[PDB]
Design a protein around this ligand. Structure first.
Ligand SMILES: *[C@@H]1O[C@H](CO)[C@@H](O[C@@H]2O[C@H](CO)[C@@H](O)[C@H](O)[C@H]2NC(C)=O)[C@H](O)[C@H]1NC(C)=O
Ligand SMILES: *[C@@H]1O[C@H](CO)[C@@H](O[C@@H]2O[C@H](CO)[C@@H](O)[C@H](O)[C@H]2NC(C)=O)[C@H](O)[C@H]1NC(C)=O
Ligand SMILES: *[C@@H]1O[C@H](CO)[C@@H](O[C@@H]2O[C@H](CO)[C@@H](O)[C@H](O)[C@H]2NC(C)=O)[C@H](O)[C@H]1NC(C)=O
Lengths: 33, 49
């Protein structure tokens, strides 16, 4: 992830999560009931 | 289970670029409805004749 100093971890999919969602997407899915 | 698309991994690196050397003139069709059939119903004739 060498993008010239730009960080996209919050929007790229998280390998740790089984759903393969981003942290922002995971937060969005959690906040909808 | 459906396949979303063919897999393509873009070869990203910090110092390489891809430049097109040719072009294709592509003509595509787009169909859009504009109007419907103009229908009028005589309410008295329809319900009672
Ligand atoms: C990009 O951003 C992520 C998250 O904002 C950074 O990950 C953090 O790294 C620090 C240092 O190890 C940890 O203490 C945090 O817990 C991490 N956050 C998360 C959410 O895991 C990451 O270091 C940044 N830089 C790069 C190059 O990825
Ligand atoms: C530009 O160079 C890259 C890396 O040398 C090429 O990417 C490779 O393409 C082949 C053919 O599909 C793949 O088998 C490799 O896995 C690719 N490498 C990576 C790191 O993704 C790329 O095809 C080249 N561009 C052109 C137009 O030839
Ligand atoms: C760019 O692409 C066009 C395709 O449209 C190439 O034109 C073809 O060239 C070959 C070789 O001379 C001919 O056999 C074909 O009949 C041509 N096709 C058409 C539609 O004319 C063109 O040569 C390409 N140019 C480069 C620089 O790659």
């Amino acid at each position: 992830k060498d993008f010239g100093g730009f960080n996209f971890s919050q929007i790229l999919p998280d390998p740790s999560k089984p759903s393969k969602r981003s942290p922002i997407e995971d937060l969005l899915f959690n906040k909808v009931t | 289970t459906m396949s979303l698309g063919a897999e393509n991994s873009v070869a990203y690196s910090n110092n390489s670029i891809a430049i097109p050397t040719n072009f294709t003139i592509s003509v595509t069709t787009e169909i859009l409805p504009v109007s419907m059939t103009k229908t009028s119903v005589d309410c008295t004739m329809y319900i009672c004749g």
